[PDB]
Tab-separated table of C-alpha atoms in Angstrom:
chain	number	residue	atom	x	y	z
A	1	UNK	CA	-127.717	28.055	-110.598
A	2	UNK	CA	-128.839	31.519	-109.510
A	3	UNK	CA	-129.079	32.124	-105.752
A	4	UNK	CA	-129.717	35.883	-105.320
A	5	UNK	CA	-131.385	37.144	-108.522
A	6	UNK	CA	-134.533	37.143	-110.675
A	7	UNK	CA	-135.351	37.873	-114.313
A	8	UNK	CA	-136.305	41.483	-114.946
A	9	UNK	CA	-139.971	42.007	-115.655
A	10	UNK	CA	-140.919	42.291	-119.317
A	11	UNK	CA	-139.563	45.850	-119.253
A	12	UNK	CA	-137.214	44.675	-122.011
A	13	UNK	CA	-138.827	41.820	-123.950
A	14	UNK	CA	-139.437	42.993	-127.528
A	15	UNK	CA	-138.628	46.557	-126.456
A	16	UNK	CA	-136.734	48.062	-129.431
A	17	UNK	CA	-134.458	50.078	-127.114
A	18	UNK	CA	-133.066	46.825	-125.678
A	19	UNK	CA	-130.183	45.515	-127.794
A	20	UNK	CA	-130.540	41.773	-127.091
A	21	UNK	CA	-132.840	39.246	-128.747
A	22	UNK	CA	-132.145	36.118	-126.658
A	23	UNK	CA	-130.293	37.131	-123.500
A	24	UNK	CA	-132.635	38.384	-120.755
A	25	UNK	CA	-131.585	40.900	-118.104
A	26	UNK	CA	-131.652	39.922	-114.449
A	27	UNK	CA	-132.030	41.992	-111.278
A	28	UNK	CA	-130.908	41.553	-107.672
A	29	UNK	CA	-133.528	40.494	-105.168
A	30	UNK	CA	-131.916	43.331	-103.102
A	31	UNK	CA	-132.365	46.181	-105.594
A	32	UNK	CA	-133.690	48.383	-102.793
A	33	UNK	CA	-130.376	48.054	-100.967
A	34	UNK	CA	-128.672	49.048	-104.210
A	35	UNK	CA	-130.728	52.242	-104.526
A	36	UNK	CA	-130.239	53.050	-100.826
A	37	UNK	CA	-126.458	52.759	-101.170
A	38	UNK	CA	-126.559	55.018	-104.224
A	39	UNK	CA	-128.475	57.652	-102.243
A	40	UNK	CA	-125.899	57.348	-99.457
A	41	UNK	CA	-123.068	57.957	-101.941
A	42	UNK	CA	-124.926	60.995	-103.282
A	43	UNK	CA	-125.244	62.442	-99.776
A	44	UNK	CA	-121.619	61.617	-98.960
A	45	UNK	CA	-120.486	63.727	-101.936
A	46	UNK	CA	-123.138	66.403	-102.514
A	47	UNK	CA	-124.955	66.502	-99.163
A	48	UNK	CA	-128.554	65.632	-98.390
A	49	UNK	CA	-129.917	68.839	-99.952
A	50	UNK	CA	-128.206	68.260	-103.321
A	51	UNK	CA	-128.990	64.623	-104.077
A	52	UNK	CA	-128.888	64.275	-107.846
A	53	UNK	CA	-126.389	67.048	-108.594
A	54	UNK	CA	-124.814	64.492	-110.942
A	55	UNK	CA	-126.748	61.387	-112.045
A	56	UNK	CA	-125.077	58.103	-111.221
A	57	UNK	CA	-126.385	54.541	-111.150
A	58	UNK	CA	-130.141	55.033	-110.625
A	59	UNK	CA	-132.596	54.123	-113.376
A	60	UNK	CA	-136.333	53.564	-113.883
A	61	UNK	CA	-135.749	49.904	-114.840
A	62	UNK	CA	-133.209	49.092	-112.136
A	63	UNK	CA	-130.033	50.280	-110.462
A	64	UNK	CA	-126.842	49.819	-112.479
A	65	UNK	CA	-125.456	47.519	-109.794
A	66	UNK	CA	-128.801	45.796	-109.244
A	67	UNK	CA	-128.948	44.608	-112.866
A	68	UNK	CA	-125.266	44.280	-113.840
A	69	UNK	CA	-124.230	42.437	-110.668
A	70	UNK	CA	-127.623	40.845	-110.186
A	71	UNK	CA	-126.171	37.627	-108.706
A	72	UNK	CA	-124.288	39.369	-105.873
A	73	UNK	CA	-124.748	38.830	-102.147
A	74	UNK	CA	-126.830	41.618	-100.526
A	75	UNK	CA	-124.008	43.335	-98.606
A	76	UNK	CA	-121.885	43.278	-101.755
A	77	UNK	CA	-124.717	44.577	-103.958
A	78	UNK	CA	-124.974	47.578	-101.640
A	79	UNK	CA	-121.177	47.988	-101.703
A	80	UNK	CA	-121.066	47.858	-105.504
A	81	UNK	CA	-123.952	50.301	-105.879
A	82	UNK	CA	-122.173	52.758	-103.574
A	83	UNK	CA	-118.788	52.515	-105.287
A	84	UNK	CA	-120.221	52.714	-108.809
A	85	UNK	CA	-122.296	55.734	-107.792
A	86	UNK	CA	-119.069	57.353	-106.620
A	87	UNK	CA	-117.193	56.358	-109.793
A	88	UNK	CA	-119.921	57.912	-111.961
A	89	UNK	CA	-118.640	61.251	-110.566
A	90	UNK	CA	-115.211	60.818	-112.187
A	91	UNK	CA	-115.769	63.403	-114.894
A	92	UNK	CA	-116.511	65.965	-112.165
A	93	UNK	CA	-113.785	65.090	-109.629
A	94	UNK	CA	-110.996	63.622	-111.772
A	95	UNK	CA	-108.249	65.535	-109.950
A	96	UNK	CA	-109.536	64.619	-106.487
A	97	UNK	CA	-109.635	60.957	-107.442
A	98	UNK	CA	-106.176	60.886	-109.039
A	99	UNK	CA	-104.835	62.462	-105.848
A	100	UNK	CA	-106.743	60.055	-103.582
A	101	UNK	CA	-105.484	56.969	-105.433
A	102	UNK	CA	-101.974	58.511	-105.465
A	103	UNK	CA	-101.831	57.714	-109.184
A	104	UNK	CA	-100.276	59.848	-111.926
A	105	UNK	CA	-102.662	60.762	-114.755
A	106	UNK	CA	-100.703	60.488	-118.007
A	107	UNK	CA	-103.742	61.133	-120.176
A	108	UNK	CA	-104.891	64.713	-120.465
A	109	UNK	CA	-107.779	65.472	-118.076
A	110	UNK	CA	-111.288	64.938	-119.448
A	111	UNK	CA	-113.468	68.055	-119.884
A	112	UNK	CA	-114.860	69.297	-116.572
A	113	UNK	CA	-118.280	70.896	-116.207
A	114	UNK	CA	-117.797	74.265	-114.440
A	115	UNK	CA	-120.968	73.705	-112.345
A	116	UNK	CA	-118.932	71.133	-110.367
A	117	UNK	CA	-116.050	73.363	-109.207
A	118	UNK	CA	-117.528	73.355	-105.710
A	119	UNK	CA	-114.691	73.005	-103.157
A	120	UNK	CA	-116.996	71.463	-100.569
A	121	UNK	CA	-118.008	68.791	-103.066
A	122	UNK	CA	-114.353	68.193	-103.902
A	123	UNK	CA	-113.463	67.791	-100.222
A	124	UNK	CA	-116.443	65.464	-99.733
A	125	UNK	CA	-115.289	63.412	-102.717
A	126	UNK	CA	-111.812	63.112	-101.200
A	127	UNK	CA	-113.325	61.860	-97.928
A	128	UNK	CA	-115.569	59.388	-99.779
A	129	UNK	CA	-112.637	58.076	-101.830
A	130	UNK	CA	-110.755	57.513	-98.604
A	131	UNK	CA	-113.632	55.641	-96.968
A	132	UNK	CA	-115.035	53.226	-99.546
A	133	UNK	CA	-111.807	51.276	-100.357
A	134	UNK	CA	-111.277	50.326	-96.694
A	135	UNK	CA	-114.849	49.051	-96.375
A	136	UNK	CA	-114.398	47.169	-99.651
A	137	UNK	CA	-111.087	45.565	-98.659
A	138	UNK	CA	-112.571	44.623	-95.281
A	139	UNK	CA	-115.582	42.843	-96.798
A	140	UNK	CA	-113.301	40.727	-99.029
A	141	UNK	CA	-109.541	40.915	-98.335
A	142	UNK	CA	-108.688	38.872	-101.461
A	143	UNK	CA	-110.884	40.358	-104.200
A	144	UNK	CA	-111.335	43.858	-102.758
A	145	UNK	CA	-107.833	45.148	-103.612
A	146	UNK	CA	-108.268	43.845	-107.174
A	147	UNK	CA	-110.786	46.602	-107.909
A	148	UNK	CA	-108.666	49.514	-106.690
A	149	UNK	CA	-105.505	48.332	-108.437
A	150	UNK	CA	-107.494	47.938	-111.654
A	151	UNK	CA	-108.780	51.475	-111.090
A	152	UNK	CA	-105.219	52.755	-110.702
A	153	UNK	CA	-104.115	50.858	-113.813
A	154	UNK	CA	-106.936	52.512	-115.740
A	155	UNK	CA	-106.098	56.022	-114.506
A	156	UNK	CA	-102.489	55.620	-115.682
A	157	UNK	CA	-103.634	54.017	-118.939
A	158	UNK	CA	-103.519	55.073	-122.552
A	159	UNK	CA	-105.077	58.351	-123.638
A	160	UNK	CA	-107.693	57.815	-126.334
A	161	UNK	CA	-108.294	61.402	-127.463
A	162	UNK	CA	-105.192	61.705	-129.713
A	163	UNK	CA	-105.943	58.206	-131.041
A	164	UNK	CA	-109.500	58.919	-132.236
A	165	UNK	CA	-108.359	60.440	-135.533
A	166	UNK	CA	-106.069	57.465	-136.263
A	167	UNK	CA	-108.029	54.303	-135.426
A	168	UNK	CA	-108.276	52.292	-138.624
A	169	UNK	CA	-110.764	49.700	-137.340
A	170	UNK	CA	-113.736	49.742	-135.005
A	171	UNK	CA	-112.223	46.693	-133.300
A	172	UNK	CA	-109.171	48.638	-132.123
A	173	UNK	CA	-111.453	51.493	-131.076
A	174	UNK	CA	-113.570	49.131	-128.956
A	175	UNK	CA	-110.544	47.466	-127.382
A	176	UNK	CA	-109.513	50.862	-126.080
A	177	UNK	CA	-113.064	51.985	-125.196
A	178	UNK	CA	-113.642	49.027	-122.833
A	179	UNK	CA	-110.909	50.508	-120.632
A	180	UNK	CA	-112.316	54.022	-120.993
A	181	UNK	CA	-115.641	52.931	-119.481
A	182	UNK	CA	-113.681	50.909	-116.892
A	183	UNK	CA	-114.857	47.430	-117.782
A	184	UNK	CA	-111.857	45.879	-115.992
A	185	UNK	CA	-113.391	47.376	-112.847
A	186	UNK	CA	-116.844	46.154	-113.894
A	187	UNK	CA	-115.521	42.594	-114.202
A	188	UNK	CA	-113.625	42.815	-110.905
A	189	UNK	CA	-116.897	43.994	-109.352
A	190	UNK	CA	-118.774	41.061	-110.881
A	191	UNK	CA	-116.221	38.597	-109.501
A	192	UNK	CA	-116.378	40.279	-106.079
A	193	UNK	CA	-120.164	40.437	-105.814
A	194	UNK	CA	-120.757	36.730	-106.425
A	195	UNK	CA	-117.745	35.875	-104.215
A	196	UNK	CA	-116.312	33.714	-106.978
A	197	UNK	CA	-113.102	31.762	-106.443
A	198	UNK	CA	-111.463	31.795	-109.868
A	199	UNK	CA	-107.850	31.396	-110.846
A	200	UNK	CA	-106.156	33.690	-113.324
A	201	UNK	CA	-105.895	30.704	-115.669
A	202	UNK	CA	-109.675	30.168	-115.665
A	203	UNK	CA	-110.394	33.817	-116.370
A	204	UNK	CA	-107.788	33.752	-119.160
A	205	UNK	CA	-109.374	30.569	-120.500
A	206	UNK	CA	-112.651	32.375	-121.193
A	207	UNK	CA	-111.503	35.943	-121.969
A	208	UNK	CA	-112.008	35.279	-125.708
A	209	UNK	CA	-115.526	33.941	-125.173
A	210	UNK	CA	-116.541	37.105	-123.416
A	211	UNK	CA	-114.857	39.694	-125.697
A	212	UNK	CA	-117.970	40.153	-127.947
A	213	UNK	CA	-120.099	41.062	-124.916
A	214	UNK	CA	-117.643	43.735	-123.743
A	215	UNK	CA	-117.598	45.123	-127.285
A	216	UNK	CA	-121.416	45.086	-127.169
A	217	UNK	CA	-121.354	47.135	-123.970
A	218	UNK	CA	-119.061	49.780	-125.430
A	219	UNK	CA	-121.270	50.139	-128.494
A	220	UNK	CA	-124.498	50.357	-126.480
A	221	UNK	CA	-122.947	52.936	-124.142
A	222	UNK	CA	-121.832	54.952	-127.175
A	223	UNK	CA	-125.303	54.741	-128.729
A	224	UNK	CA	-127.104	56.017	-125.647
A	225	UNK	CA	-124.446	58.441	-124.300
A	226	UNK	CA	-123.716	60.197	-127.600
A	227	UNK	CA	-126.299	62.920	-127.013
A	228	UNK	CA	-124.808	64.020	-123.694
A	229	UNK	CA	-121.304	63.696	-125.147
A	230	UNK	CA	-122.328	65.909	-128.078
A	231	UNK	CA	-123.776	68.550	-125.775
A	232	UNK	CA	-120.616	68.452	-123.644
A	233	UNK	CA	-118.392	68.819	-126.690
A	234	UNK	CA	-120.561	71.571	-128.172
A	235	UNK	CA	-120.287	73.698	-124.996
A	236	UNK	CA	-117.108	73.221	-122.945
A	237	UNK	CA	-114.271	72.664	-125.394
A	238	UNK	CA	-113.795	71.099	-128.807
A	239	UNK	CA	-110.044	71.132	-128.285
A	240	UNK	CA	-110.908	67.627	-127.181
A	241	UNK	CA	-111.985	64.982	-129.670
A	242	UNK	CA	-115.193	63.206	-128.704
A	243	UNK	CA	-114.498	59.642	-127.542
A	244	UNK	CA	-117.347	57.795	-129.209
A	245	UNK	CA	-117.797	55.259	-131.976
A	246	UNK	CA	-120.221	57.566	-133.828
A	247	UNK	CA	-117.748	60.251	-135.040
A	248	UNK	CA	-115.348	57.423	-135.872
A	249	UNK	CA	-118.079	55.718	-137.910
A	250	UNK	CA	-118.629	58.991	-139.751
A	251	UNK	CA	-114.911	59.212	-140.542
A	252	UNK	CA	-114.370	55.563	-141.527
A	253	UNK	CA	-117.653	54.718	-143.282
A	254	UNK	CA	-119.213	58.082	-144.185
A	255	UNK	CA	-122.183	57.560	-141.863
A	256	UNK	CA	-124.470	60.265	-140.498
A	257	UNK	CA	-125.248	60.139	-136.769
A	258	UNK	CA	-128.526	58.283	-137.379
A	259	UNK	CA	-126.841	55.779	-139.697
A	260	UNK	CA	-124.039	55.299	-137.156
A	261	UNK	CA	-126.600	54.588	-134.429
A	262	UNK	CA	-128.272	52.030	-136.706
A	263	UNK	CA	-124.836	50.491	-137.320
A	264	UNK	CA	-124.206	50.204	-133.576
A	265	UNK	CA	-127.615	48.638	-132.892
A	266	UNK	CA	-127.281	45.974	-135.572
A	267	UNK	CA	-123.653	45.365	-134.557
A	268	UNK	CA	-124.721	44.582	-131.001
A	269	UNK	CA	-127.317	42.105	-132.254
A	270	UNK	CA	-124.541	40.462	-134.287
A	271	UNK	CA	-122.292	40.552	-131.197
A	272	UNK	CA	-124.904	38.745	-129.106
A	273	UNK	CA	-125.026	36.085	-131.826
A	274	UNK	CA	-121.214	35.842	-131.898
A	275	UNK	CA	-120.915	35.487	-128.124
A	276	UNK	CA	-123.573	32.770	-128.253
A	277	UNK	CA	-121.614	30.895	-130.933
A	278	UNK	CA	-118.367	31.144	-128.939
A	279	UNK	CA	-120.134	30.001	-125.765
A	280	UNK	CA	-121.594	26.897	-127.469
A	281	UNK	CA	-118.193	26.031	-128.878
A	282	UNK	CA	-116.644	26.354	-125.400
A	283	UNK	CA	-119.336	24.251	-123.746
A	284	UNK	CA	-119.113	21.521	-126.368
A	285	UNK	CA	-115.337	21.183	-125.872
A	286	UNK	CA	-115.848	21.440	-122.097
A	287	UNK	CA	-119.354	20.131	-121.346
A	288	UNK	CA	-121.312	22.142	-118.811
A	289	UNK	CA	-121.720	19.283	-116.321
A	290	UNK	CA	-117.926	19.005	-115.928
A	291	UNK	CA	-117.150	22.753	-115.877
A	292	UNK	CA	-116.386	24.140	-112.392
A	293	UNK	CA	-119.372	25.732	-110.688
A	294	UNK	CA	-117.644	29.088	-110.290
A	295	UNK	CA	-116.857	29.178	-114.025
A	296	UNK	CA	-120.539	28.607	-114.795
A	297	UNK	CA	-121.364	31.403	-112.344
A	298	UNK	CA	-118.830	33.554	-114.200
A	299	UNK	CA	-120.780	32.973	-117.415
A	300	UNK	CA	-123.918	34.047	-115.548
A	301	UNK	CA	-122.101	37.148	-114.264
A	302	UNK	CA	-120.938	38.154	-117.743
A	303	UNK	CA	-124.408	37.743	-119.241
A	304	UNK	CA	-125.766	39.814	-116.340
A	305	UNK	CA	-123.163	42.523	-116.970
A	306	UNK	CA	-123.990	42.726	-120.680
A	307	UNK	CA	-127.795	42.561	-120.466
A	308	UNK	CA	-128.059	44.813	-117.417
A	309	UNK	CA	-125.772	47.421	-118.941
A	310	UNK	CA	-127.811	47.321	-122.152
A	311	UNK	CA	-131.147	47.858	-120.404
A	312	UNK	CA	-129.577	50.441	-118.070
A	313	UNK	CA	-128.006	52.518	-120.851
A	314	UNK	CA	-131.348	52.795	-122.668
A	315	UNK	CA	-133.224	54.131	-119.617
A	316	UNK	CA	-130.883	55.480	-116.910
A	317	UNK	CA	-130.882	59.079	-115.707
A	318	UNK	CA	-127.143	59.062	-116.508
A	319	UNK	CA	-127.959	59.364	-120.242
A	320	UNK	CA	-131.583	60.520	-120.491
A	321	UNK	CA	-133.811	63.301	-119.173
A	322	UNK	CA	-134.518	64.313	-116.484
A	323	UNK	CA	-130.865	63.448	-115.687
A	324	UNK	CA	-129.993	64.300	-112.061
A	325	UNK	CA	-133.474	65.594	-111.277
A	326	UNK	CA	-134.730	62.031	-111.784
A	327	UNK	CA	-133.229	61.342	-108.348
A	328	UNK	CA	-135.669	63.568	-106.458
A	329	UNK	CA	-138.818	61.420	-106.552
A	330	UNK	CA	-137.287	58.080	-105.415
A	331	UNK	CA	-135.258	59.932	-102.789
A	332	UNK	CA	-138.351	61.521	-101.271
A	333	UNK	CA	-140.212	58.243	-101.425
A	334	UNK	CA	-137.469	56.547	-99.445
A	335	UNK	CA	-137.457	59.527	-97.070
A	336	UNK	CA	-141.187	59.140	-96.388
A	337	UNK	CA	-140.730	55.399	-95.790
A	338	UNK	CA	-138.418	56.335	-92.911
A	339	UNK	CA	-135.028	55.315	-94.305
A	340	UNK	CA	-132.170	57.008	-92.433
A	341	UNK	CA	-128.934	58.157	-94.084
A	342	UNK	CA	-125.699	59.610	-92.754
A	343	UNK	CA	-125.406	63.336	-93.411
A	344	UNK	CA	-121.585	63.243	-93.627
A	345	UNK	CA	-119.335	60.432	-94.830
A	346	UNK	CA	-117.086	60.944	-91.776
A	347	UNK	CA	-119.998	60.393	-89.343
A	348	UNK	CA	-119.539	56.606	-89.345
A	349	UNK	CA	-117.077	53.825	-90.114
A	350	UNK	CA	-119.827	51.958	-91.970
A	351	UNK	CA	-121.189	52.547	-95.453
A	352	UNK	CA	-124.798	52.991	-94.354
A	353	UNK	CA	-126.861	53.470	-91.205
A	354	UNK	CA	-127.647	49.761	-91.084
A	355	UNK	CA	-124.155	48.761	-92.164
A	356	UNK	CA	-124.987	47.723	-95.733
A	357	UNK	CA	-128.772	48.122	-95.609
A	358	UNK	CA	-130.150	51.367	-93.974
A	359	UNK	CA	-131.983	51.620	-90.641
A	360	UNK	CA	-135.587	52.492	-89.676
A	361	UNK	CA	-136.787	50.949	-92.974
A	362	UNK	CA	-135.700	48.354	-95.551
């Protein structure tokens, strides 16, 4: 039973851009805290006069964290919005993050936009990547470290670029792509936000139920991020193979880009149906009234992750115009409402002026 979340407003029902037919997206009651924490992250990296230099988690139909971790406690929803805003800057500060996690990058570095070789932004990123893990591990000493070790395990993970020309099935592609978009971290975040007490055995017991939803999320990300990935690969370097299901679908099935997008959309409808089948089989073998409460909450968290990511990918400034500039209007509207932000990430030991909220407003 949901304790911190509501159904998104019919900004999704029968909308063709939304790749679910049954599952509804949900949003935190504390979405404003999510957006405030994202603004704070933006200032902590770029500075208050360059908010939106790179688009992160914000979106017209809800913050990434506000919809994907909709059932999280308010402090934790702010924490997750901040950290995911900072992680959206990976493709600009890869080196600074590998150095700040003290992790060796065995994959070749992703293409870097030259407009982000700003040493003051790289230093700010290093300071931010020092601060947020201590605040995270202090909010939850048990689940907090899980996220950073999963982040380190992803940074030292397999490289997908040499594999793109050799995948023989979309299934293998997707099983690598989940890691590329850091869904281990997304699921650690979901467990952290709802403060769930789950054993490794329980998570393992339902990993196969949830696999279709993770595959769904990779396909929907590919669908809506292809255009920016194609503009990145058409300008700074083709010596890198594009990591996306769409070129692979061209190679394996002879599909144009439009036909590949249609394939992805229908595949995610099928994947919703498949997850629903697997879930009903699980809950008939283990009836819902006798399943531990935290496992039922975990089902809620996974459905939130999938539906929120789907509605976010179709609308967010991370994949659609006006990209970073879409940050300017909400920012100014929270500035006029009197919300106060730290100008430097070193100014305070806390995430935000109000701790996890903001001061002088809401």
